[PDB]
Each structure stands twice: as structure tokens, then as C-alpha cells.
Amino acid sequence: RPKMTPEQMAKEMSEFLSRGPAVLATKAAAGTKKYDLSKWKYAELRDTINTSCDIELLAACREEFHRRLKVYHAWKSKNKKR
């Protein structure tokens, strides 16, 4: 496989979410972090959603992106500067 970059995955992730819909409303009694895919690799996540059909699952992945996205941008912004 080719060489992967944090900026590349960050762009693919961010846009991935912006592309997906947002008419969700399953919010009930609060509960969605029931799926911990933090370990899943960017390739695994994107892949799963690319070849999956599970609502809850799909959501989990997307959520794992948004999370590691704001964090990646935060830590990066803090690490960038000297």
C-alpha cells in the first residue's frame, strides 16, 4: 500500500462526515458511545463504513473520526508551534 499522511486522512475524514447526512434523531436516553472503535485504523474505519450496512456501527465510525479529528487538530496546533 502507498504512504499515508495525517493531513490526508484528516481531510478524507472531515469531508467524509460533511458528505454524510445529518437528519439523525435516534437520541434516546442518551447512549451511542457503546461502540469503541478508537483502536480501529483509519483504513479499517473508512473501509467498514465503505462496505457496511449497520446504522449504529456506521455512526460509531463517523463519531470516531470527528473525535480524533478535533483532537488531531488540537494536539497538532499545540505541537506545531515551538
Query: Where along the chain do its domains lie?
Result: 1-82
DSSP three-state, residue 14 = helix
Half-sphere exposure of 6 (CA within 13 A, CB side): 8
Q: CB of 59 within 8 A of CB of 3?
A: no
Which residues are within 8 A (CB) of 66 and not within 5 positions of it... i.e. 6 or more apart?
13, 17
For residue 24, give the amino acid letter: L
Nearest-angstrom CA–CA distance, 67 and 76:
14
Nearest-angstrom CA–CA distance, 11 and 3:
15
Method for this entry: NMR
From the DSSP assignment, how many helices (H) and strands (E) are in the chain? 3, 0
Q: Which three cell numbers stand for residue 1?
A: 500500500
DSSP class of residue 57?
Answer: H
64's enclosing H/E stretch is helix 55-80
Nearest-angstrom CA–CA distance, 74 and 30:
26
Q: Which three cell numbers stand for residue 32?
A: 451511542
- CB-neighbour burial class of residue 39 (10 A; exposed 0-12, middle 13-18, buried 19+): exposed
- Listed residue (49, 56, 51) closest to 27, CA to CA: 56
